[PDB]
RNA sequence: GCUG
DNA sequence: TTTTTTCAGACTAGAGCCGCTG
DNA sequence: CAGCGGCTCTAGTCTGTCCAGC
């Protein structure tokens, strides 16, 4: 009876806790990195579209989507610096 | 305006038996039955309170509706509760699969100790399309016998030796052996740092040798945890069925209240005992009483899967037998047979057998009394419309009559004797249902209790007759291996035109 | 007896609804002696999971 | 409109064996989707052919015959590129109501695109001036069950110009 | 606050009440015995 | 015998000399006190109302080795009977910190999807998001 | 094991309420009614 | 270890694609499959698994190697998804160790998989001319100066020769002149170089500022002659030592030779084996400091005192209460971080015992606070997954009412708050995942 | 316990 | 603290055993 | 001279013992 009340609590709370976002200042660099490949992974070419939209589209209609300076100079250097193994 | 829902049946193709992990209990349990070890029945007039008895988990009696529908104990299916264990626990049902994985995986590292070539081999058997149930049941224990054949292991090089089921519900791997060979440093250290523990206990001293990992719920629980996704076919588990953790026990679901009209004792004791380990650990108590404790909860969980689980410590031996669930689906009057296979059955009677010499090899002559109960349905078709009116008329008290009258429209039932029978005869149409009593020509099967061969049931043509005593040909006698010394024996009504037909032409 | 079951998960729902996969959708009926639904419902308590798949007659 | 290839197993009760099946199930499946909007599909209406009938099994319960039956029926779905002709059945001040000819008054348009003299000001005016042309515009169905509308669409009235009617 | 939960003769045939004692059990609680007879001449079936 | 006591009012009193650290100066070996933690024990700390002034080195080591566990110096040369090297040097922090708030919480563990304790909905990352 | 049986033989078709394949079963029931595959229509 | 195939789920899921994830996924989940059979068993159209198999072992996360059956079999190594986490943290230590150019030679060598000398050079001399000035263009040679300056200390190691079996089709690999020959990067020195400002940072934090400097020339002139397989560094002499200062000391070399003893004797122990065993004891202190408060640490302190001394001196050796320090134990076992009796040497008894005595086993508690971070990144990403679909109505206006920008600005308080997040517990896990491979054999 |  | 109250039965581990098997 | 392979062996243990009817 001294515990048939009702779900023990609906969150139970922890005295002590995280301390802080801990790194603070230097994760400003990778932090902006984490969200910039971010951008750049999802619009790169290494992905996949859902062509399975457009075979649920049996709406196709022309007009929408639906239808439709490096400066250098040559050299070459091939090194080995690296393992010569498997 | 309104969508198209499609109303509709289907049929079981593939029964495919699995766990439940413990999250996906709780996605299914409806309610925390975490209240009270009291039993619910509030302190006054009896009604349910948040626990075992919640109502949010059904109904057991018809007056009182469930919580989650309003539907009654008729129409209620059930709902599910979970009790969530301080300590976890393991089940009796899978312990000995637990004692086998152990065997099987490093107690360090987690992989199954089977050789990478030795892996390949084994992968591919169990790649080869046809592995029917048989074939899975002899791989593990090929595999698990190069494994408890393996003591060291090709993933981390951890020393794993015997795992052997000391006691009941106890596990106890080797880790640190002692042999004649020279020990090895780590071991050693382990057996020879303790000074204060030899200091304190005289016992230790000439018994410091002898010290085993013991393998308890706890370690158990991260171990399994850790197995590798790879790892978990060669233990021979489907991974979409279950997986190696949901093996030991952290949620139980408590049972749908329609499924229990002791059971439900075993459950407020179970939540009494979850209460008592919890005060315990705030109010200080030692380990040893901790880990009895642990062990009295482990005890009345088992006992709660398998009552008898022969082995119980005598200090906590139970006080009287109760049937937990194991104890409900055995034995003939077990669910599986008495309630499944053989089941008790509505439009039969049984009567002390008579001869009768003028009757046909094909015919039994019914009491009039047993004709009047047991009925026929009979659905109103354009050639019996005259003859059911006439007998709608009769009523229940003549034989010729019926006793009941089902609308087309609705499934409810009319007793022709309240009501109305003239009335009721002319409102008949097409497509109704009327409950004719038993009449002369009707299909019955009769069937004598000590059946040993196919002969024991045969159909009889029935043809009323005056006399109490089901009074057959005495031709037909030896097929029941029946005498009229006193035998009694039962007769079945078919209830529909496809039974009748089977019945009559087989 | 007629109880209700889902197609996804192959639990027992109830009034068209399964508390499990909270979508409604997949929820069929299916004929089945009711003594067969107390024993999934007690190998369901017990953690032994009766799973059903079921498919239209034809 | 636009045909939309089904398969159902129509149930033939045991009364109905005079009549001729391809009749029998017609009569049937107009009984099972008219007047009712199948999600992601639309508004059926009736029934255009039975293009393939296979086998009437009886199974061992209730004595009746169950055909699966392949068939055709034309439904209702704007494909998004349809300038239709309807009628106002109603004025809300968020936006007007058309209604198709008898056909749906389930069409909701909303409006904010047509000529900078709009506005419903609950006495029912149409619109500030400068049969009732709609354009479709969304497919947006609502599928009901939830516990123990439906085809609504967005309709749209650009700067067609309208010369008969301003 | 009293629900009746009467005493109700259940045989398929009749019975004449032959004796009705009432008395008190160890613990005095006014028993009531009743003493029914039927007589049955021999039919086909004994 | 003395169950009746707080040691914990004691712990900052026989930490105190060993924050504030005078001469962090490299000039020398600075091979550190302990004798002295030992001399600072038995004639008078920082002030403090205190019932047994009787000063007995079984009594008042044993601080000492519970504030290791709150890391403080280990013992160098203890198995002098009362006067040897005895090395001691106040550890700092090794690392940094390496939690976040969903390590706290033992019963949110249970979750593994949108579930009764899904955290795409739990309470504990919407109060760290303020 | 993840044992997925189908439902056939006696000793379950009887548990599961569902006609065995044995005896009147191995044979399934079609109506010579009148039907035929027919011809649609132009559209 | 299903929490760690739950973030190889998420980890593909926000980089590639869906079904690059999905036969990605499989793939950990049943490992050495054929093309054909991996088609059939996640319900994919074949065209679509020969895509994603080749955008998989572009980024090196799907190996391919045929035995006995002439077919090969595909295998996904799964610790290496994982390291796509740590991508962000592979850039930075290239900006500290290099240049703006070599920091973004490592970043296109980890976007774009597999890359030639002759293409990675021309792209970075895409990107860093259109951030210069025009008209001031970046000349490329100095990219070709920096490309191997990063492979003279081996951060960038070259593909293994290729199989070219024939089921293996050449073309598909390369997206589309010279061929030259691939490379991916060699993340296994970033994990030599992270353990180096690993433990150059455990000593400055604990020792003194002279200490760690000397570690980490002893460390940095112990880089090529080493490997991660290696139980400890190669052992230098102390004149070297002298020669291989930075040019900020001055100390002489006797002072610095007390301090060299000083550090070569310590509880800490350059011992590589010691180094990683200790780090982790920390971080697990780290943890019952975040979780427990300071009084339930100094006991799990304690038992990495004395192995098997346990009940009998844990009341005493704290001071604190009974009532107060056998809750912090039971919730230390029940958390299992204090592991388990395993003393207890009276036959099958509960009750009657030669006393249970507590005591940490060091990996258990690693394995589980690993598999606990493995956790953690999966409601990391998950809400960050939450919280993004539904506020694409205002990111494109920009591109508005008051609470419309409000939300905006919570939200990417919140994101910022969640990447930032994913990171600082990503550092736990290679300080603890090295000290789980250092403690493996046979790997 | 007895009938079956 | 002190009795048993059917009769097999073909599984499952251990205990060895001796001898070649290296 | 040493080891692990199968042996081989005793007991150990859980598992049944007709249908139902009052
Ligand atoms: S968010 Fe998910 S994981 Fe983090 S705490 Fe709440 S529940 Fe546990
Ligand atoms: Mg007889
Ligand atoms: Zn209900
Ligand atoms: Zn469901």
Redesign the interface.
């Given at each position: 009876f001294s515990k048939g009340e009702k779900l023990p609590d609906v969150v139970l709370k922890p005295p002590p806790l995280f301390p802080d976002t801990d790194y603070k200042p230097v994760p400003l660099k990778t932090g902006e990195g984490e969200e910039y490949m971010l951008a750049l992974k999802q619009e790169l070419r290494e992905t996949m579209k859902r062509m399975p939209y457009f075979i649920e589209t049996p709406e196709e209609r022309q007009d929408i989507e639906r239808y439709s300076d490096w400066r250098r100079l040559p050299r070459e250097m091939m090194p080995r610096n690296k393992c010569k193994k498997a | 305006e309104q969508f198209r829902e499609t109303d509709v049946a289907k049929k079981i193709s593939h029964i495919c038996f699995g766990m439940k992990s413990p999250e996906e209990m709780r996605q299914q349990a409806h309610i925390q039955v975490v209240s009270k070890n009291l039993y619910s029945q509030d302190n006054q007039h009896a009604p349910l309170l948040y626990g075992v008895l919640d109502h949010r988990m059904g109904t057991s009696e018809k007056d009182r509706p469930c919580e989650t529908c309003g539907k009654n104990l008729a129409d209620c299916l059930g709902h599910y509760g979970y009790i969530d264990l301080e300590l976890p626990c393991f089940h009796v049902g899978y312990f000995r699969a637990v004692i086998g994985i152990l065997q099987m995986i490093c107690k360090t590292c987690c992989h199954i100790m089977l050789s990478q070539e030795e892996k390949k081999q084994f992968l591919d058997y169990l790649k080869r399309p046809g592995l029917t149930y048989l074939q899975k049941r002899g791989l593990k224990k090929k595999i698990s016998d190069k494994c408890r054949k393996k003591n060291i292991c090709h993933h981390c090089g951890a020393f794993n030796g015997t795992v052997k089921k000391c006691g009941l519900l106890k596990i106890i791997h080797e880790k640190y052996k002692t042999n004649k060979k020279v020990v090895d440093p780590i071991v050693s250290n382990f057996l020879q740092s303790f000074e204060t523990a030899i200091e304190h206990n005289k016992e230790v001293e000439p018994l410091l040798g002898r010290a085993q990992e013991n393998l308890n719920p706890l370690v158990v629980l991260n171990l399994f945890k850790r197995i590798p996704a790879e790892d978990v076919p060669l233990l021979l588990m489907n991974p979409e069925a279950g997986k190696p953790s949901d093996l030991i026990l952290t949620r139980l679901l408590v049972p749908p209240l329609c499924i229990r009209p002791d059971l439900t004792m075993k459950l407020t004791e179970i939540i009494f005992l979850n209460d008592v380990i919890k005060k315990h650990r705030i109010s200080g108590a030692k380990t040893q009483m901790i880990m009895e404790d642990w062990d009295f909860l482990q005890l009345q969980c088992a006992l709660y899967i398998n009552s008898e689980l022969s082995g119980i410590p005598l200090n906590m031996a139970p006080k009287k037998w109760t049937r937990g669930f194991v104890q409900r689906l055995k034995g003939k009057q077990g669910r599986f047979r008495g309630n499944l296979s053989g089941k008790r059955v509505d439009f039969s009677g049984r009567t002390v057998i008579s001869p009768d010499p003028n009757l046909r090899i094909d015919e039994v002559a019914v009491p009039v009394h047993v004709a009047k109960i047991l009925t026929f349905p009979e659905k109103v078709n354009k050639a019996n419309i005259n003859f059911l009116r006439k007998l709608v008329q009769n009523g229940p008290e003549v034989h010729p009559g019926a006793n009941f009258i089902q609308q087309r429209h609705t499934q409810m039932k009319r007793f022709l004797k309240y009501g109305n029978r003239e009335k009721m005869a002319q409102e008949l149409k097409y497509g109704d249902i009327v409950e004719r009593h038993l009449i002369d020509g009707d299909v019955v099967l009769f069937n004598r209790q000590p059946s040993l061969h196919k002969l024991s049931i045969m159909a009889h043509l029935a043809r009323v007759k005056p006399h109490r005593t089901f009074r057959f040909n005495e031709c037909v006698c030896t097929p029941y291996n029946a005498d009229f010394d006193g035998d009694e024996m039962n007769l079945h009504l078919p209830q529909t035109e496809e039974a009748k037909a089977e019945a009559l032409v087989l | 007896f007629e109880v209700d079951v889902c197609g996804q998960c192959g639990l027992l729902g109830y009034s068209g609804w399964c508390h499990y996969c909270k979508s409604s959708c997949h929820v069929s009926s299916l004929r089945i002696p009711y003594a067969c639904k107390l024993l999934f419902q007690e190998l369901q308590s017990m953690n032994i999971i009766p799973r059903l798949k079921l498919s239209k007659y034809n | 409109f636009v045909?939309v290839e089904m398969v159902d197993?129509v149930r033939?009760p045991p009364?109905q064996?005079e009549?001729?099946?391809?009749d029998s199930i017609a009569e049937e499946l107009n009984k099972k989707?008219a007047?009712?909007?199948?999600?992601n599909v639309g508004?059926?209406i009736c029934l255009?052919?039975?293009?393939?009938?296979?086998?009437?099994?009886?199974?061992?319960g209730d004595?009746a015959?169950?055909?699966?039956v392949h068939f055709?029926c034309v439904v209702f779905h704007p494909?998004?590129?349809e300038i239709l002709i309807g009628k106002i059945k109603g004025c809300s001040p968020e936006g007007v109501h058309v209604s198709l000819g008898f056909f749906?008054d389930?069409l909701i348009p909303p409006e904010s695109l047509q000529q900078p003299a709009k506005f419903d000001e609950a006495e029912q005016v149409w619109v500030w001036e400068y049969g009732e042309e709609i354009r479709f515009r969304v497919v947006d169905?609502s599928?009901?069950?939830?516990?123990?509308?439906?085809?609504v669409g967005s309709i749209s009235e650009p700067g067609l110009g309208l010369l008969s009617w301003w | 606050q009293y629900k009746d939960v009467p005493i109700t003769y259940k045989g398929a045939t009749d019975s004449y009440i032959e004796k009705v004692m009432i008395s008190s059990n160890a613990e005095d609680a006014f028993l009531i015995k009743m003493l029914l007879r039927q007589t049955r001449r021999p039919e086909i079936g004994d | 015998k003395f169950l009746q006591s707080k040691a914990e009012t004691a712990r900052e009193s026989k930490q105190n000399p060993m924050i504030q650290r005078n001469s962090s100066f490299a000039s020398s070996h600075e091979v550190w006190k302990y004798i002295c933690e030992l001399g600072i024990s038995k004639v008078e700390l920082s002030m403090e109302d205190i019932e047994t002034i009787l000063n007995t080195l079984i009594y008042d080591g044993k601080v000492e080795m519970t504030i290791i566990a709150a890391k403080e110096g280990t013992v160098g040369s203890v198995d002098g009977h009362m006067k040897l090297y005895r090395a001691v040097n106040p550890i700092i922090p090794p690392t940094g910190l390496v939690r976040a708030p969903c390590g706290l919480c033992p019963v949110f563990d249970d979750c593994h999807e949108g579930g009764e304790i899904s955290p795409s909905n739990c309470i504990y990352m919407t109060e760290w998001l303020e | 094991f993840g044992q997925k049986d189908s439902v056939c033989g006696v000793s379950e078709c009887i548990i599961m309420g569902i006609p065995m394949n044995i005896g009147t079963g191995l044979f399934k029931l079609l109506h010579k009614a009148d039907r035929d595959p027919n011809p649609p229509k132009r559209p | 270890t299903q929490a760690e195939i739950k973030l190889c789920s998420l980890l593909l899921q926000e980089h590639f694609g869906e079904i690059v994830e999905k036969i990605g996924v499989h793939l950990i989940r049943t490992g050495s499959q054929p093309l054909r059979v991996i088609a059939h068993d996640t319900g994919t159209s074949l065209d679509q698994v020969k895509k994603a198999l080749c955008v998989l072992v572009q980024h090196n996360l799907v190996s391919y190697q045929v035995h006995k059956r002439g077919v090969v079999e595909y295998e996904a190594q799964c610790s290496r998804v994982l390291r796509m986490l740590r991508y962000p943290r592979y850039i930075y230590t290239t900006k500290t160790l290099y240049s703006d150019t070599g920091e973004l030679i490592v970043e296109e060598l980890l976007l774009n998989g597999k890359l030639t000398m002759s293409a990675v050079v021309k792209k970075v001399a895409d990107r860093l001319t259109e951030t210069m000035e025009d008209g001031k263009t970046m000349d490329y040679a100095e990219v070709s100066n920096t490309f191997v300056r990063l492979a003279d200390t081996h951060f960038v190691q070259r593909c293994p020769s290729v199989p070219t079996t024939e089921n293996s089709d050449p073309g598909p690999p390369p997206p589309a002149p010279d061929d030259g020959i691939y490379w991916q990067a060699n993340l296994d020195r970033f994990h030599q170089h992270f353990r180096d400002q690993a433990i150059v940072s455990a000593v400055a934090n604990r020792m003194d500022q002279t200490s760690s400097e000397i570690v980490r020339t002893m460390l940095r002139m112990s880089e090529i002659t080493t490997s991660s397989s290696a139980p400890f560094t190669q052992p230098l002499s102390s004149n070297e030592i002298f020669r291989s200062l930075p040019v900020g000391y001055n100390i002489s070399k006797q002072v610095l030779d007390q301090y060299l003893t000083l550090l070569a004797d310590d509880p800490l122990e350059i011992n590589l084996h010691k180094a990683l065993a200790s780090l982790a004891t920390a971080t697990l202190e780290s943890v019952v400091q975040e979780r427990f408060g300071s009084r339930c640490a100094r006991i799990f302190r304690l038992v990495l005192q004395k192995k098997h001394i346990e009940q009998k001196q844990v009341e005493d050796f704290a001071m604190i209460p009974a009532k107060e320090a056998k809750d912090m134990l039971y919730k230390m076992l029940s958390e299992n971080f204090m592991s388990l009796q395993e003393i207890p040497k009276t036959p099958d008894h509960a009750p009657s015992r030669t006393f249970y005595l507590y005591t940490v086993n060091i990996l258990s508690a690693a394995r589980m606070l690993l598999h606990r971070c493995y956790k953690s990144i999966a409601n990391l990403i998950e809400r960050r997954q939450f919280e993004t679909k539904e506020n694409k109505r205002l990111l494109e206006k920009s591109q508005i009412t008051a609470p419309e920008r409000q939300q905006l600005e919570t939200l990417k308080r919140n994101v910022n708050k969640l990447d930032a997040s994913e990171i600082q517990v990503d550092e736990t896990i290679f300080l603890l995942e090295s000290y789980i491979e250092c403690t493996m054999k046979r790997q």
């Amino acid at each position: 009876f001294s515990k048939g009340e009702k779900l023990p609590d609906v969150v139970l709370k922890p005295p002590p806790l995280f301390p802080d976002t801990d790194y603070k200042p230097v994760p400003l660099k990778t932090g902006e990195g984490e969200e910039y490949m971010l951008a750049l992974k999802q619009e790169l070419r290494e992905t996949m579209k859902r062509m399975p939209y457009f075979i649920e589209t049996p709406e196709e209609r022309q007009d929408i989507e639906r239808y439709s300076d490096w400066r250098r100079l040559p050299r070459e250097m091939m090194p080995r610096n690296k393992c010569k193994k498997a | 305006e309104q969508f198209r829902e499609t109303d509709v049946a289907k049929k079981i193709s593939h029964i495919c038996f699995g766990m439940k992990s413990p999250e996906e209990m709780r996605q299914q349990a409806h309610i925390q039955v975490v209240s009270k070890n009291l039993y619910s029945q509030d302190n006054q007039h009896a009604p349910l309170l948040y626990g075992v008895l919640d109502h949010r988990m059904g109904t057991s009696e018809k007056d009182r509706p469930c919580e989650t529908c309003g539907k009654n104990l008729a129409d209620c299916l059930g709902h599910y509760g979970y009790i969530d264990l301080e300590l976890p626990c393991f089940h009796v049902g899978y312990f000995r699969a637990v004692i086998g994985i152990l065997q099987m995986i490093c107690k360090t590292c987690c992989h199954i100790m089977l050789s990478q070539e030795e892996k390949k081999q084994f992968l591919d058997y169990l790649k080869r399309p046809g592995l029917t149930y048989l074939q899975k049941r002899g791989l593990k224990k090929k595999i698990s016998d190069k494994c408890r054949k393996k003591n060291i292991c090709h993933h981390c090089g951890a020393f794993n030796g015997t795992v052997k089921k000391c006691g009941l519900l106890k596990i106890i791997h080797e880790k640190y052996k002692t042999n004649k060979k020279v020990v090895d440093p780590i071991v050693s250290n382990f057996l020879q740092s303790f000074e204060t523990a030899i200091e304190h206990n005289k016992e230790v001293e000439p018994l410091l040798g002898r010290a085993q990992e013991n393998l308890n719920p706890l370690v158990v629980l991260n171990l399994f945890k850790r197995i590798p996704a790879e790892d978990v076919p060669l233990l021979l588990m489907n991974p979409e069925a279950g997986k190696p953790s949901d093996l030991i026990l952290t949620r139980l679901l408590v049972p749908p209240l329609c499924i229990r009209p002791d059971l439900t004792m075993k459950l407020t004791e179970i939540i009494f005992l979850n209460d008592v380990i919890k005060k315990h650990r705030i109010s200080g108590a030692k380990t040893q009483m901790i880990m009895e404790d642990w062990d009295f909860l482990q005890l009345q969980c088992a006992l709660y899967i398998n009552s008898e689980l022969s082995g119980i410590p005598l200090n906590m031996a139970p006080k009287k037998w109760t049937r937990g669930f194991v104890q409900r689906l055995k034995g003939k009057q077990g669910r599986f047979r008495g309630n499944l296979s053989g089941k008790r059955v509505d439009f039969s009677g049984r009567t002390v057998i008579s001869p009768d010499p003028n009757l046909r090899i094909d015919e039994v002559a019914v009491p009039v009394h047993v004709a009047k109960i047991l009925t026929f349905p009979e659905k109103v078709n354009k050639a019996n419309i005259n003859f059911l009116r006439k007998l709608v008329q009769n009523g229940p008290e003549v034989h010729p009559g019926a006793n009941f009258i089902q609308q087309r429209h609705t499934q409810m039932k009319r007793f022709l004797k309240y009501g109305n029978r003239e009335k009721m005869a002319q409102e008949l149409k097409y497509g109704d249902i009327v409950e004719r009593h038993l009449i002369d020509g009707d299909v019955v099967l009769f069937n004598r209790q000590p059946s040993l061969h196919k002969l024991s049931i045969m159909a009889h043509l029935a043809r009323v007759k005056p006399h109490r005593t089901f009074r057959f040909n005495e031709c037909v006698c030896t097929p029941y291996n029946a005498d009229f010394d006193g035998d009694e024996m039962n007769l079945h009504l078919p209830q529909t035109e496809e039974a009748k037909a089977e019945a009559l032409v087989l | 007896f007629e109880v209700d079951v889902c197609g996804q998960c192959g639990l027992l729902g109830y009034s068209g609804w399964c508390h499990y996969c909270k979508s409604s959708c997949h929820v069929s009926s299916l004929r089945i002696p009711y003594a067969c639904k107390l024993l999934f419902q007690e190998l369901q308590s017990m953690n032994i999971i009766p799973r059903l798949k079921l498919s239209k007659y034809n | 409109f636009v045909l939309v290839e089904m398969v159902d197993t129509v149930r033939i009760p045991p009364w109905q064996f005079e009549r001729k099946l391809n009749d029998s199930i017609a009569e049937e499946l107009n009984k099972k989707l008219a007047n009712k909007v199948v999600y992601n599909v639309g508004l059926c209406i009736c029934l255009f052919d039975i293009t393939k009938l296979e086998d009437a099994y009886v199974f061992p319960g209730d004595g009746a015959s169950h055909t699966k039956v392949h068939f055709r029926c034309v439904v209702f779905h704007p494909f998004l590129d349809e300038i239709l002709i309807g009628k106002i059945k109603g004025c809300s001040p968020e936006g007007v109501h058309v209604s198709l000819g008898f056909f749906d008054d389930i069409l909701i348009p909303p409006e904010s695109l047509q000529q900078p003299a709009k506005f419903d000001e609950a006495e029912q005016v149409w619109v500030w001036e400068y049969g009732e042309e709609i354009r479709f515009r969304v497919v947006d169905e609502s599928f009901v069950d939830t516990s123990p509308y439906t085809l609504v669409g967005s309709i749209s009235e650009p700067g067609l110009g309208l010369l008969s009617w301003w | 606050q009293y629900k009746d939960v009467p005493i109700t003769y259940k045989g398929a045939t009749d019975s004449y009440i032959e004796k009705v004692m009432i008395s008190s059990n160890a613990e005095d609680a006014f028993l009531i015995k009743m003493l029914l007879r039927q007589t049955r001449r021999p039919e086909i079936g004994d | 015998k003395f169950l009746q006591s707080k040691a914990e009012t004691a712990r900052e009193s026989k930490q105190n000399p060993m924050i504030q650290r005078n001469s962090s100066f490299a000039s020398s070996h600075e091979v550190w006190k302990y004798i002295c933690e030992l001399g600072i024990s038995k004639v008078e700390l920082s002030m403090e109302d205190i019932e047994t002034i009787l000063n007995t080195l079984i009594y008042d080591g044993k601080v000492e080795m519970t504030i290791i566990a709150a890391k403080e110096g280990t013992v160098g040369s203890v198995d002098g009977h009362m006067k040897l090297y005895r090395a001691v040097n106040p550890i700092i922090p090794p690392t940094g910190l390496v939690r976040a708030p969903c390590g706290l919480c033992p019963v949110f563990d249970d979750c593994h999807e949108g579930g009764e304790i899904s955290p795409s909905n739990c309470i504990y990352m919407t109060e760290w998001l303020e | 094991f993840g044992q997925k049986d189908s439902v056939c033989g006696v000793s379950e078709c009887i548990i599961m309420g569902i006609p065995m394949n044995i005896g009147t079963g191995l044979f399934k029931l079609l109506h010579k009614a009148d039907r035929d595959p027919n011809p649609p229509k132009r559209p | 270890t299903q929490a760690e195939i739950k973030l190889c789920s998420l980890l593909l899921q926000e980089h590639f694609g869906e079904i690059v994830e999905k036969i990605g996924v499989h793939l950990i989940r049943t490992g050495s499959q054929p093309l054909r059979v991996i088609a059939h068993d996640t319900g994919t159209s074949l065209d679509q698994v020969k895509k994603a198999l080749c955008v998989l072992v572009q980024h090196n996360l799907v190996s391919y190697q045929v035995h006995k059956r002439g077919v090969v079999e595909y295998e996904a190594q799964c610790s290496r998804v994982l390291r796509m986490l740590r991508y962000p943290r592979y850039i930075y230590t290239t900006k500290t160790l290099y240049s703006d150019t070599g920091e973004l030679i490592v970043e296109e060598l980890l976007l774009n998989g597999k890359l030639t000398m002759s293409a990675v050079v021309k792209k970075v001399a895409d990107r860093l001319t259109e951030t210069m000035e025009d008209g001031k263009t970046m000349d490329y040679a100095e990219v070709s100066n920096t490309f191997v300056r990063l492979a003279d200390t081996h951060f960038v190691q070259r593909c293994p020769s290729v199989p070219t079996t024939e089921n293996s089709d050449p073309g598909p690999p390369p997206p589309a002149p010279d061929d030259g020959i691939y490379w991916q990067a060699n993340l296994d020195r970033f994990h030599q170089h992270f353990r180096d400002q690993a433990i150059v940072s455990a000593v400055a934090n604990r020792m003194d500022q002279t200490s760690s400097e000397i570690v980490r020339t002893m460390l940095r002139m112990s880089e090529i002659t080493t490997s991660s397989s290696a139980p400890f560094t190669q052992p230098l002499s102390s004149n070297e030592i002298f020669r291989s200062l930075p040019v900020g000391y001055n100390i002489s070399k006797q002072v610095l030779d007390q301090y060299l003893t000083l550090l070569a004797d310590d509880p800490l122990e350059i011992n590589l084996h010691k180094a990683l065993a200790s780090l982790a004891t920390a971080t697990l202190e780290s943890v019952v400091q975040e979780r427990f408060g300071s009084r339930c640490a100094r006991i799990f302190r304690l038992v990495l005192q004395k192995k098997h001394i346990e009940q009998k001196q844990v009341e005493d050796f704290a001071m604190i209460p009974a009532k107060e320090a056998k809750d912090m134990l039971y919730k230390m076992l029940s958390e299992n971080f204090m592991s388990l009796q395993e003393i207890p040497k009276t036959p099958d008894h509960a009750p009657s015992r030669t006393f249970y005595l507590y005591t940490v086993n060091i990996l258990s508690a690693a394995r589980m606070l690993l598999h606990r971070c493995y956790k953690s990144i999966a409601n990391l990403i998950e809400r960050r997954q939450f919280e993004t679909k539904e506020n694409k109505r205002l990111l494109e206006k920009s591109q508005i009412t008051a609470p419309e920008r409000q939300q905006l600005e919570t939200l990417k308080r919140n994101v910022n708050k969640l990447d930032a997040s994913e990171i600082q517990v990503d550092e736990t896990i290679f300080l603890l995942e090295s000290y789980i491979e250092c403690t493996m054999k046979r790997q």
